[PDB]
Amino acid sequence: EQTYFISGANRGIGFSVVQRLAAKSGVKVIATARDPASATALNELAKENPQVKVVQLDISDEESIKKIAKNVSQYTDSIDVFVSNAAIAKSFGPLLNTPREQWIEHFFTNVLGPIRLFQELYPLIKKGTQKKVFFISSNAGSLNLDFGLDFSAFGQSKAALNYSTKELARQLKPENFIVAAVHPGFVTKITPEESAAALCKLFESLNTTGKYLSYDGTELPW
Amino acid sequence: MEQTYFISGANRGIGFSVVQRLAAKSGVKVIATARDPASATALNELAKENPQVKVVQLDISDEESIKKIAKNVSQYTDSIDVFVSNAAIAKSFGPLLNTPREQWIEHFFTNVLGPIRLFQELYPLIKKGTQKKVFFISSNAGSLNLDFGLDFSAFGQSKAALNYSTKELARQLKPENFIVAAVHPGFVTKITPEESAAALCKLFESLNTTGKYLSYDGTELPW
Ligand SMILES: NC(=O)C1=CN([C@@H]2O[C@H](COP(=O)(O)OP(=O)(O)OC[C@H]3O[C@@H](n4cnc5c(N)ncnc54)[C@H](OP(=O)(O)O)[C@@H]3O)[C@@H](O)[C@H]2O)C=CC1
Ligand SMILES: NC(=O)C1=CN([C@@H]2O[C@H](COP(=O)(O)OP(=O)(O)OC[C@H]3O[C@@H](n4cnc5c(N)ncnc54)[C@H](OP(=O)(O)O)[C@@H]3O)[C@@H](O)[C@H]2O)C=CC1
Secondary structure, three states, X not given: OEEEEEOOOOOHHHXXXXXXXXXXOOEEEEEEXXXXXXXXXXXXXXXXXXXXXXXXXXXXXXXXXXXXXXXHHOOOOOOOEEEEOOOOOOOOOOHHHOOHHHHHHHHHHHHHHHHHHHHHHXXXXXXXXXXXXXXXXXXXXXXXXXXXXXXXXXXXXXXXXXXXXXXXXHHHHHHOOEEEEEEOOOOOOOOHHHHHHHHHHHHHHOOOXXXXXXXXXXXXXX | OOEXXXXXXXXXXXXXXXXXXXXXXXXXXXXXXXXXXXXXXXXXXHHHHOOOEEEEEOOOOOHHHHHHHHHHHHHHOOOOOEEEEOOOOOOOOOOHHHOOHHHHHHHHHHHHHHHHHHHHHHHHHHHOOOOOEEXXXXXXXXXXXXXXXXXXXXXXXXXXXXXXXXXXXXXXXHHHOOEEEEEEOOEOOEOOHHHHHHHHHHHHHHOOOOOEEEEOOOOEOOO
């Protein structure tokens, strides 16, 4: 039996991942929402598949992160596969036109949030069997891709977390952790369904650390 | 053909050495900043002997200080030819699990937001100058593609984050004929601040291409 943890499971790719894991036998899922009482789809997911555990997490909120280990510990002794999915993408375009609040929000939500979350949940991952750690990144976060778009605070935040993900992969290799940054795809666009199926395949199959992977299993340049 | 340079963090280190270097060049006005000018002994003595050097207050962690830098710099000049974001911190190294919340925050505000805000406020002054050059003092530690077998924690992340945004800015301002660079000033191979400042000042003067990540010696670094 394996415990997966998924932040931001109330809608989008996160809901799609939880819905697919729920179908796989011997999988417990800790699923988070900012507001689990409004998370209508996820609550019915969990009611029909009670191996899905619905927990409060706001990744912008240090008081919420300071509770996540307790909240997860209610349902499990360990985490096999940790997935930092919950994130924002509110600010694009030129730097001269990106205000202070946009830079601050993407940093706290998209960089600090996931680092604090991983810090809080490391003890539980440590005790699990798979020791897999996924941060949902974006190809927009590469220092070495040109989309003909500016990504402002969004891109900056994905590049920032990518830098720390790379370091974390190095730091935990001695502990046999598998650490990855994964672009979930453009969800040519793709459905949350497709993104999620590809994401679950990669989560199960990935056997080496320090990779930056697109959903299809191919590598991206940091 | 008089030029104006702006150097943040000129009270000590590389920044002091850059201002000292520029102070020796004929036709070069230097706006030099310190968080606490009253205690900037060496920079004040330089400025007392060399009236081309203007000392102004700036705390790049402090939005209230940033909201004032443009009007304060404008008392001393109508334009900036060469903008150098040098002031920065480096206090957070080693593993992610040992780096507390406050270190990630401080490096973001001082090393990412500060320089971005400082550039936002000084852009009109720079647009009005001739050279239109914009330097961010980065680190080779900020590269997503260099391995030094060291952890750089929040310091490294802050330099990578500012690098990402520097690369974007170079694209955005290419049509306005700006030159934008991230520059590694060296390990201050061990070099002195004065050695770094001599190399940096040659590079500021000579660089005629935008979007480069460079070392002090003018060689390129991978993003
Ligand atoms: N979709 C795409 O094409 C691309 C997206 N990505 C990555 O994909 C992920 C998006 O996943 P998906 O669920 O489909 O996205 P959605 O846009 O559908 O929604 C974002 C998710 O994050 C949650 N969330 C937002 N802010 C917070 C917060 N402060 N605290 C807690 N939860 C929060 C949302 O919950 P709530 O409903 O409460 O807001 C929701 O679950 C991101 O990690 C992003 O980096 C990367 C590249 C492109
Ligand atoms: N030294 C090296 O080997 C390397 C240096 N660098 C970069 O080179 C640049 C210069 O480094 P170095 O001279 O050694 O730095 P120092 O540590 O010697 O000093 C940094 C400078 O920034 C100022 N400063 C710090 N915080 C603030 C703030 N909140 N507001 C305004 N000014 C501030 C300091 O003023 P105060 O006296 O008030 O603290 C000082 O003038 C930095 O951007 C640094 O990151 C990068 C990698 C290698």
